[PDB]
Amino acid sequence: SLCIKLLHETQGHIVTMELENGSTYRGKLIEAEDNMNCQMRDISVTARDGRVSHLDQVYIRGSHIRFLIVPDMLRNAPMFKVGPGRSVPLPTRGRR
Amino acid sequence: PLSQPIIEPIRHKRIAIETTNVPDTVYKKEFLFGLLTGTDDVRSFIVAG
Amino acid sequence: KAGAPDLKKYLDRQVFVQLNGSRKVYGVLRGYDIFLNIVLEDSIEEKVDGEKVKIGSVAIRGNSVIMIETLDK
Amino acid sequence: MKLVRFLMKLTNETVSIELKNGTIVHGTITSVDMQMNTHLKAVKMTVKGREPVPVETLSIRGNNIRYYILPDSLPLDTLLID
Amino acid sequence: GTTKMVSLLNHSLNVTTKDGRTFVGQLLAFDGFMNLVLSDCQEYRHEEKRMLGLVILRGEFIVSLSVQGPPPMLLSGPGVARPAGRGIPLGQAPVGLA
Amino acid sequence: PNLQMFGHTAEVLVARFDPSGSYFASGGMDRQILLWNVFDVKNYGVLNGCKGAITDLQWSRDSRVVYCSSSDTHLMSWDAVSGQKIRKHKGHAGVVNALDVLKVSELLTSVSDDCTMKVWDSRSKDCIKTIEEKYPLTAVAIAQQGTQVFIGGIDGAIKIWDLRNNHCSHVLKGHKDIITSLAISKDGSSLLSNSMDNTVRIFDVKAQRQLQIFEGAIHGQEHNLLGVAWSRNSRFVGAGSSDKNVYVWSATGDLRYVLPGHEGSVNHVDFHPHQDIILSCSSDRTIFLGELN
């Protein structure tokens, strides 16, 4: 599915997100998942209060994520057709 | 001498294949510049053997 | 499904977990799960007061987990 | 072997839908899916603690649907058959 | 199924979420979980606004969907003409008779 | 000028302007509708597909979509901008003979040799109504209101039907034989009609008696469906004949212009919506644009 591949493509860039917790996190993204796990660095948190903090490394659970906010160049990225028997989108030379 | 025409014929000297126009390809061209300009997605290398 | 998460790099290192109900825990990462159930040893609470109680070996549930941090680089 | 299959027959009628959110939605049904995701036509939806606002093409994330209040003219015995 | 959902693609949408917040923008990509991707997004928390950009929502978070606006955006046959002339027929009467 | 443009391979039947007055369409036995300009008189698209011969064109009142009435039951639909197919309105079990359109380009009426009138929506691909008479029908006209539909058959009896009632409200009388083309004025107040008796009569829409029987335009053995039109003012009446002559009337009961030019039988005469021009078609494979200064 495409909504997951877009995420994997923003690895490296800086990302903003929102959790069920209520707080938003901002930082460089290192790894993601099909679950919607994340692995980030140099995070700058900002809760409901406005309280800023620093977190060196973080892992997440996707279940806990509400929504992400992604860089602007990631709208020209390709959105593929996928297929019935494939996990990752990718381009497809073969039959279909 | 005879060989040399007199009215020169037009002659397009071509060495190698090239496409008159860009060939259309899946990923859009701006997104290729996006990568090339924006980030560390880019790599480079030499294929050898 | 069942993407076994990338927690190999945290094994046998200290952590600063956060869980549901704004409760959080420190511990050495022993083992992990498909569903992100965790095994922590030398578990210490961080109460809302700040009173730190030593517990020992502990198994935190996957569902609960919000996040997982590293104290030292 | 599902009660969901009966809702695929339901198409066309108007219903006031209640959600977990606590809203209320008058509108005609166009299509119903196996995962409960319904799409509506000519809708008048009202939010919990706000004035009613008309929407043309509403669609709902099935998960949120509490119950359909069906019209009184619809025969149940005929629809419960495959 | 998901036949209806492809029809919505590239329309400006109004998406209410479980929090109450409402996101707005075009729809680029769509999922089986109802993960939506949205372009040039704007929340309306309520007399309020914010600019985000590209937003990827989960399925858990989404409540309802609604279109704001519509989707944004034999050479020459044989025939030839001529000038005038308008010849007079000597005979009258129909075509087949004589 | 006059402009006698050539192009079709075989007998051409129908040729009409847009409602705007910027094109022709034409097409008969060729199985090819050929679009044209008015003001550098050149061809455009070869609308190809109809597997029966064409019997009637009509522009959509948007000036984009075109509708045919082939001899193989189809009624096709064409995007005049691009030139692609849209649909095949499959219905009748015989040869279609006439078409008519409304203001709202959405509704169409067709007329078979199955003795069946049928109203069509441009959205369903099926019949909305089916009015079965008895003897194969031939000519039809729908009013500007989108209410009254006029049917012309073999009895000489132009029947009138509404879309609400669907009852034999009225029947025009005094036409001995065959109807080849009905035509409602730009008012909605009077018909025209070509009979095989050569009496090119006008009728009333609302009391419902005759007005003026015109006489002098012969049909014969050919058995083509000849046409009639109302001019943009509704002053002049333009009836073609199998005598190779375009008999234009004065609408007061006076023959003014009788211009020959064709070498074969004439079919469907027309008028331009504003400037005084006459489209005249004929088996001959030719077409004229007769003017008045």
Short mmCIF file of N, CA, C and O in Angstrom, two decimals, chain A residues 35-86:
data_model
loop_
_atom_site.label_atom_id
_atom_site.label_comp_id
_atom_site.label_asym_id
_atom_site.label_seq_id
_atom_site.Cartn_x
_atom_site.Cartn_y
_atom_site.Cartn_z
N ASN A 35 4.07 -1.72 10.25
CA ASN A 35 3.28 -1.47 11.46
C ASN A 35 3.06 0.03 11.71
O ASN A 35 2.02 0.43 12.22
N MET A 36 4.06 0.83 11.32
CA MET A 36 4.14 2.28 11.58
C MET A 36 4.95 2.57 12.84
O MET A 36 4.76 3.60 13.50
N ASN A 37 5.87 1.67 13.17
CA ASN A 37 6.93 1.96 14.14
C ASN A 37 7.80 3.07 13.57
O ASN A 37 7.80 3.30 12.37
N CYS A 38 8.56 3.73 14.43
CA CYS A 38 9.50 4.75 13.98
C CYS A 38 10.78 4.74 14.82
O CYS A 38 10.79 4.24 15.94
N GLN A 39 11.85 5.28 14.24
CA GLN A 39 13.12 5.42 14.94
C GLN A 39 13.76 6.74 14.55
O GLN A 39 14.18 6.92 13.41
N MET A 40 13.83 7.66 15.52
CA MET A 40 14.22 9.04 15.24
C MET A 40 15.36 9.51 16.13
O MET A 40 15.71 8.85 17.11
N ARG A 41 15.94 10.65 15.77
CA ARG A 41 17.04 11.26 16.53
C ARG A 41 16.87 12.76 16.66
O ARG A 41 16.22 13.40 15.84
N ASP A 42 17.48 13.32 17.71
CA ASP A 42 17.47 14.75 17.98
C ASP A 42 16.03 15.29 18.03
O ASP A 42 15.73 16.33 17.45
N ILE A 43 15.17 14.58 18.74
CA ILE A 43 13.75 14.92 18.75
C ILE A 43 13.48 16.13 19.64
O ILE A 43 14.08 16.29 20.70
N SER A 44 12.56 16.98 19.18
CA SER A 44 12.11 18.15 19.93
C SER A 44 10.61 18.03 20.19
O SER A 44 9.78 18.40 19.36
N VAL A 45 10.27 17.51 21.37
CA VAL A 45 8.88 17.25 21.74
C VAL A 45 8.20 18.55 22.14
O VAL A 45 8.85 19.49 22.58
N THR A 46 6.88 18.60 21.97
CA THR A 46 6.06 19.71 22.47
C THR A 46 4.66 19.20 22.82
O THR A 46 3.84 18.92 21.94
N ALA A 47 4.39 19.10 24.12
CA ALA A 47 3.15 18.50 24.62
C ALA A 47 1.97 19.49 24.53
O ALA A 47 2.04 20.49 23.82
N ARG A 48 0.88 19.17 25.24
CA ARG A 48 -0.27 20.08 25.37
C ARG A 48 0.08 21.37 26.13
O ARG A 48 -0.45 22.44 25.83
N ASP A 49 0.96 21.25 27.13
CA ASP A 49 1.37 22.39 27.95
C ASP A 49 2.19 23.40 27.14
O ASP A 49 2.08 24.61 27.35
N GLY A 50 3.00 22.88 26.22
CA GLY A 50 4.02 23.67 25.51
C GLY A 50 5.42 23.30 25.95
O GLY A 50 6.40 23.89 25.49
N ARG A 51 5.53 22.30 26.84
CA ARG A 51 6.80 21.90 27.42
C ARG A 51 7.71 21.24 26.39
O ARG A 51 7.38 20.19 25.84
N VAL A 52 8.86 21.88 26.14
CA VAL A 52 9.86 21.36 25.21
C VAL A 52 10.82 20.43 25.95
O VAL A 52 11.05 20.60 27.15
N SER A 53 11.36 19.46 25.23
CA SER A 53 12.36 18.55 25.78
C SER A 53 13.26 18.02 24.67
O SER A 53 13.09 18.35 23.50
N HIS A 54 14.24 17.20 25.06
CA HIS A 54 15.13 16.53 24.11
C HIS A 54 15.17 15.04 24.39
O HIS A 54 15.30 14.62 25.54
N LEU A 55 15.07 14.25 23.33
CA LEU A 55 15.16 12.80 23.42
C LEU A 55 16.15 12.32 22.36
O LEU A 55 15.98 12.59 21.17
N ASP A 56 17.18 11.61 22.81
CA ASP A 56 18.28 11.19 21.94
C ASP A 56 17.81 10.17 20.90
O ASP A 56 17.90 10.42 19.70
N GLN A 57 17.31 9.03 21.37
CA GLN A 57 16.78 7.97 20.51
C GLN A 57 15.36 7.68 20.94
O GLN A 57 15.03 7.80 22.12
N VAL A 58 14.52 7.30 19.99
CA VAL A 58 13.15 6.92 20.29
C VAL A 58 12.68 5.79 19.39
O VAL A 58 13.04 5.74 18.21
N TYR A 59 11.91 4.88 19.96
CA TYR A 59 11.11 3.92 19.20
C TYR A 59 9.65 4.26 19.50
O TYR A 59 9.37 4.90 20.51
N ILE A 60 8.73 3.87 18.63
CA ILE A 60 7.30 4.17 18.80
C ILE A 60 6.48 2.90 18.53
O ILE A 60 7.02 1.89 18.10
N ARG A 61 5.19 2.95 18.84
CA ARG A 61 4.22 2.03 18.24
C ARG A 61 3.26 2.78 17.35
O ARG A 61 2.74 3.83 17.72
N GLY A 62 3.03 2.24 16.16
CA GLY A 62 2.13 2.85 15.19
C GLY A 62 0.74 3.05 15.73
O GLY A 62 0.15 4.13 15.56
N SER A 63 0.21 2.03 16.39
CA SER A 63 -1.09 2.11 17.06
C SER A 63 -1.25 3.44 17.79
O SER A 63 -2.33 4.04 17.78
N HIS A 64 -0.17 3.91 18.42
CA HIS A 64 -0.17 5.17 19.16
C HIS A 64 -0.11 6.43 18.29
O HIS A 64 -0.43 7.51 18.78
N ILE A 65 0.30 6.31 17.02
CA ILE A 65 0.32 7.47 16.13
C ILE A 65 -1.07 7.83 15.63
O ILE A 65 -1.87 6.96 15.27
N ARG A 66 -1.35 9.14 15.61
CA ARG A 66 -2.55 9.68 15.00
C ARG A 66 -2.26 9.96 13.53
O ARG A 66 -2.90 9.39 12.65
N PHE A 67 -1.28 10.82 13.28
CA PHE A 67 -0.96 11.25 11.92
C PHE A 67 0.44 11.85 11.82
O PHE A 67 0.98 12.35 12.81
N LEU A 68 1.02 11.80 10.62
CA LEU A 68 2.35 12.36 10.36
C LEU A 68 2.27 13.65 9.56
O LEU A 68 1.24 13.98 8.99
N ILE A 69 3.40 14.36 9.52
CA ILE A 69 3.56 15.55 8.67
C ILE A 69 4.90 15.46 7.95
O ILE A 69 5.96 15.41 8.58
N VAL A 70 4.85 15.47 6.62
CA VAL A 70 5.96 15.04 5.78
C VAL A 70 6.41 16.18 4.85
O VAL A 70 5.58 17.00 4.45
N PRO A 71 7.72 16.25 4.52
CA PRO A 71 8.27 17.27 3.61
C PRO A 71 7.53 17.42 2.28
O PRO A 71 6.82 16.50 1.85
N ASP A 72 7.71 18.56 1.63
CA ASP A 72 6.88 18.94 0.49
C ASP A 72 7.24 18.24 -0.82
O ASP A 72 6.35 17.97 -1.63
N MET A 73 8.52 17.94 -1.02
CA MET A 73 8.94 17.28 -2.27
C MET A 73 8.39 15.86 -2.39
O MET A 73 8.42 15.28 -3.47
N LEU A 74 7.87 15.32 -1.29
CA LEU A 74 7.29 13.98 -1.28
C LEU A 74 5.87 13.92 -1.86
O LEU A 74 5.13 12.97 -1.60
N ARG A 75 5.49 14.91 -2.66
CA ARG A 75 4.23 14.85 -3.41
C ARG A 75 4.44 14.53 -4.89
O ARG A 75 3.50 14.09 -5.57
N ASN A 76 5.65 14.75 -5.40
CA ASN A 76 6.00 14.35 -6.77
C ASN A 76 6.46 12.90 -6.86
O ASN A 76 6.63 12.37 -7.97
N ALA A 77 6.67 12.25 -5.72
CA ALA A 77 7.06 10.84 -5.67
C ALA A 77 6.09 9.97 -6.46
O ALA A 77 4.91 10.30 -6.58
N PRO A 78 6.59 8.84 -6.99
CA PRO A 78 5.72 7.96 -7.77
C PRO A 78 4.76 7.16 -6.90
O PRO A 78 5.13 6.68 -5.83
N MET A 79 3.52 7.03 -7.38
CA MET A 79 2.52 6.17 -6.76
C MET A 79 2.20 5.05 -7.74
O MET A 79 1.57 5.28 -8.77
N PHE A 80 2.63 3.84 -7.40
CA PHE A 80 2.54 2.70 -8.31
C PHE A 80 1.20 1.98 -8.26
O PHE A 80 0.31 2.34 -7.50
N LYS A 81 1.07 0.96 -9.10
CA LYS A 81 -0.17 0.22 -9.23
C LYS A 81 -0.25 -0.92 -8.22
O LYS A 81 -1.34 -1.36 -7.87
N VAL A 82 0.91 -1.39 -7.76
CA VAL A 82 0.99 -2.57 -6.89
C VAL A 82 0.43 -3.77 -7.68
O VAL A 82 0.35 -3.72 -8.91
N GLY A 83 0.07 -4.84 -6.99
CA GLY A 83 -0.59 -5.97 -7.62
C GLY A 83 -1.33 -6.76 -6.56
O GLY A 83 -1.35 -6.37 -5.39
N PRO A 84 -1.96 -7.88 -6.96
CA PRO A 84 -2.66 -8.74 -6.01
C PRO A 84 -1.72 -9.52 -5.10
O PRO A 84 -1.97 -9.64 -3.90
N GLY A 85 -0.63 -10.03 -5.68
CA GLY A 85 0.34 -10.82 -4.93
C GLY A 85 1.69 -10.14 -4.81
O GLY A 85 2.71 -10.71 -5.21
N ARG A 86 1.70 -8.93 -4.25
CA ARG A 86 2.95 -8.24 -3.89
C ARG A 86 2.75 -7.38 -2.65
O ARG A 86 1.68 -6.79 -2.45
#
